[PDB]
């Protein structure tokens, strides 16, 4: 019943005032699914990001036990939640060393850091995919990163869900533009994209309007590089694996961990002095 699913919410949801328990609000975000900040923890001293949402409740229920119950490295945790009137809260994890639009828009990386991010990112997409959740906007502002070259994906558009066109035209999929066939697959072909970003500074028809580059990805489909003898064989065919028009042919997020070209990736270390340039 209606106010056995509130009640069920209000013994979830954390206890506390969220607006005494977190200081130095920093809007970072806003859209029309709601409002991102980022925030201090009084308590622990941390820096946490704050997703605020308004009325637009049994599937609130499971997706939060679901979020609360399931830890990844790779994605910013759950860490607490609260029901402000009508509003709700979700408070997660936050990296301040910068996002990888940060580093692709500002510095240069050689494979062996791409190869790292990639894998960092496919980790982060094999477990939400083994949840039921496709992210449905991978890009590389949704990567944040730490100084020492920590990886989490970060969903501040509000698109993530469990298994109306989603996601930012640029690197959504062919079959999500023609007919919004969301699985897996589209974040793997976000990710090849991403990938494309980290060699060439942005995803292919960044020059253009979104709206016609809507256009350009239902009708090339697979997007060509501007120097692909440039780049080795092992990284050619990680793309290819990645930007297959076939969603049965593109690889899952749990294939794509075992491709030859995430074992040449360097430490993540070596991703610190392309955050510090990107940061001034
Ligand atoms: C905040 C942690 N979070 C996450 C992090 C980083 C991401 F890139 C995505 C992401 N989204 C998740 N779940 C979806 C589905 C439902 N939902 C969502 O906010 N629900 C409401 C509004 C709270 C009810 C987004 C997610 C899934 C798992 Cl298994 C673990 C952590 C998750």
Redesign the pocket.
């Known amino acids: 019943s209606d106010e056995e699913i509130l009640e069920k919410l209000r013994s979830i949801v954390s206890v506390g005032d969220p607006k005494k328990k977190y200081t130095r609000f920093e809007k970072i975000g806003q859209g029309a699914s709601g409002t991102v900040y980022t925030a201090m923890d009084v308590a622990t001293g941390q820096e946490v990001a704050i ?1 605020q ?1 308004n009325l637009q409740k049994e599937l ?1 229920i499971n ?2 036990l ?2 609360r119950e ?3 490295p790779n ?4 860490l607490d ?1 609260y029901l402000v009137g009508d509003e ?1 809260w ?1 408070v ?1 994890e936050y990296l301040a060393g910068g996002s990888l639009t940060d580093v692709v828009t500002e510095t240069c990386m050689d494979e062996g850091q791409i190869a790292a991010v990639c894998r960092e990112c496919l980790q ?1 997409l094999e ?2 995919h083994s ?1 039921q ?1 496709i ?1 449905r906007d991978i890009k590389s502002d ?1 990567i944040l990163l730490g100084m020492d070259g920590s990886v989490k ?3 501040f558009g509000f698109c ?3 298994t109306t066109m989603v996601g930012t035209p640029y690197w959504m999929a062919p079959e999500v533009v023609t007919r919004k066939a969301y699985g897996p697959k589209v974040d793997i072909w976000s990710l090849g994209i991403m990938a494309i970003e980290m060699i060439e500074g942005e995803p292919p028809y960044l020059n253009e309007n979104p709206l016609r580059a809507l256009y350009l990805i239902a009708t090339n489909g697979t997007p060509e590089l501007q120097n692909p003898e440039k780049l080795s064989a092992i990284f050619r065919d990680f793309l290819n694996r990645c930007l297959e028009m076939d969603v049965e042919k593109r690889g899952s997020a749990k294939e794509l961990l075992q491709h030859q070209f995430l074992k040449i990736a360097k430490p993540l270390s070596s991703l610190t002095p392309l955050i510090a340039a990107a940061k001034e």
């Open positions: 997703k949402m609130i997706e939060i679901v979020m399931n830890k990844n994605i910013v945790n759950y939640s709700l979700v997660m982060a477990f939400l949840n959740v992210h949704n994906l970060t969903d993530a869900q469990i």
